[PDB]
Write an enzyme that holds these catalytic residues in place. Structure first.
Site: not given
Ligand SMILES: CCCCC(=O)C1=C(O)C(=O)c2c(O)c(O)cc(O)c2C1=O
Ligand SMILES: [Mg+2]
Ligand SMILES: [Mn+2]
Ligand SMILES: [Cl-]
Length: 179
Positions: A63, A91, A117
């Site tokens: 991430e 992540d 998730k």
């Molecule tokens: C809906 C598809 C779009 C992908 C996006 O926006 C996300 C990430 O890249 C992401 O890395 C992410 C987390 O890492 C996360 O913990 C929660 C999330 O809701 C997201 C995300 O929603």
């Molecule tokens: Mg970094």
């Molecule tokens: Mn995440």
């Protein structure tokens, strides 16, 4: 307006800029979608806090990186282990237990997010680990990865943010705003 203010007061400038970047890449304006701004900042912080959690370089951060480097790290790790390359960027990577990690941070109940998730990602390989602002946490097959000491240090940070938001009345709005 006072959330944007809060975001720039409460979070380190690196987290703040990473968030602005991540949002502008979907066309969302941080000066406008201020509750998403704070939500992204917090997610990133937890990731960075989680990666310092245990042994020195137990975790590779995925991430916060740009997509090419992010994928370089993933493709590299799957080449040298053989753990199924994921269909989305996770992540972290756990060098000790040889699996990727999705980290989630929720304003709602920790079971509702964990479900979304699990169904969102599929790939049975990867690990999920949710945190809330109220100290709840849910993990994949109830395996919590870190020790209870570092985990509490994250939940303690998440609570202080909830409090400090409430202090500025911003929380009520911030809690209703999750989609
Ligand atoms: C809906 C598809 C779009 C992908 C996006 O926006 C996300 C990430 O890249 C992401 O890395 C992410 C987390 O890492 C996360 O913990 C929660 C999330 O809701 C997201 C995300 O929603
Ligand atoms: Mg970094
Ligand atoms: Mn995440
Ligand atoms: Cl700061």
């Amino acid at each position: 307006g006072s959330m944007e203010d809060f975001v720039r007061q409460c979070f380190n400038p690196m987290i703040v800029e990473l968030a602005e970047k991540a949002m502008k890449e979907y066309g969302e304006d941080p000066k406008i979608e201020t509750n998403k701004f704070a939500a992204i900042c917090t997610h990133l912080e937890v990731c960075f806090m989680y990666s310092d959690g245990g042994s020195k370089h137990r975790f590779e951060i995925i991430e916060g990186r740009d997509r090419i480097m992010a994928w370089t790290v993933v493709n590299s790790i799957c080449n040298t282990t053989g753990v199924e390359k994921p269909k989305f960027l996770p992540d972290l990577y756990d060098y000790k237990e040889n699996r990727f990690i999705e980290i989630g941070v929720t304003r709602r109940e920790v079971h509702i997010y964990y479900l979304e998730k699990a169904n969102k990602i599929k790939s049975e390989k990867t690990h999920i680990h949710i945190f809330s602002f109220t100290g709840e946490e849910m993990a994949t097959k109830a395996d919590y990865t870190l020790d209870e000491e570092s985990r509490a240090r994250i939940k303690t940070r998440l609570f202080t943010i909830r409090q400090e938001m409430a202090s500025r009345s911003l929380w009520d709005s911030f809690r209703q705003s999750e989609r």
